[PDB]
């Protein structure tokens, strides 16, 4: 598509420039282009992809919540519904872009465990965002697709990674939130979060200098979620 005629290395460089300029839509478009060159992403490039699309969908989700609760705080006049649906449709557009990228280019049988788990976690996360706004039969297929992406990522992370690996923890954190807030399974959420926090505690010894800042931070969010939920 539109980035087809640009050099992969120029797309990465322009993504980093869009990041400095806080232009996250631009940054996402650049990383999509880099991904469509068909070469695997480095750790740093994965992180550019995640940052770009988290910021774009993060603003859409926050906007959707504002309008959603204005639509309830008076529940007529169709303006609030209509604008709420409009932001909803854009949000679904971005999720679908990211799910398309993961399916067409990024999710493979090959590669390191980090990369495999990272893409499958992203898949669960982006189905979960669709779940936050879906209803009916749609919602049920969406929840099932999120569960299955998360569960597969969980199976790899337990077989191939240490329990304080940040990607492993972050995965288990997001999955626990899915249980609690989307699947309405709060006991499952609570046990996964606790089991996870504990197994990580039992090995905080075997923790990397660079990983420590992140792994401890995420163990902290598990504690904060468990407090919110008990």
């Amino acid at each position: 598509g539109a980035m087809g005629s640009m050099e992969r290395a120029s797309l990465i460089q322009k993504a980093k420039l869009a990041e400095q300029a806080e232009r996250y839509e631009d940054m996402a478009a650049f990383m999509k282009g880099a991904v469509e060159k068909g070469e695997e992403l480095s750790c740093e490039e994965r992180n550019l992809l995640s940052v770009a699309y988290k910021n774009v969908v993060g603003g859409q989700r926050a906007a959707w919540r504002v309008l959603s609760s204005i639509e309830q705080k008076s529940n007529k006049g169709p303006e609030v519904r209509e604008y709420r649906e409009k932001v909803e449709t854009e949000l679904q557009g971005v999720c679908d872009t990211v799910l398309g990228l993961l399916d067409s280019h990024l999710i493979k049988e090959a590669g390191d465990a980090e990369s495999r788990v990272f893409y499958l976690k992203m898949k669960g996360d982006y189905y979960r965002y669709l779940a936050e706004v879906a209803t009916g039969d749609d919602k049920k297929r969406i929840i099932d697709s999120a569960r299955s992406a998360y569960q597969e990522a969980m199976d790899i992370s337990k077989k191939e990674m240490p329990p304080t690996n940040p990607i492993r923890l972050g995965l288990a954190l997001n999955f626990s939130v899915f249980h609690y807030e989307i699947a309405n399974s709060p006991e499952e959420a609570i046990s996964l979060a606790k089991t996870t926090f504990d197994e990580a505690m039992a090995d905080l010894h075997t923790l990397s200098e660079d990983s420590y800042k992140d792994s401890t931070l995420i163990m902290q969010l598990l504690r904060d979620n468990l407090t919110l939920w008990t």
């Binding site: 988290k54 993060g58 939130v177 995420i218």
Partner: peptide
């Protein structure tokens, strides 16, 4: 208001 990672 559950926290997820990565944070924004």
């Amino acid at each position: 208001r559950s926290c997820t990672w990565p944070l924004p």
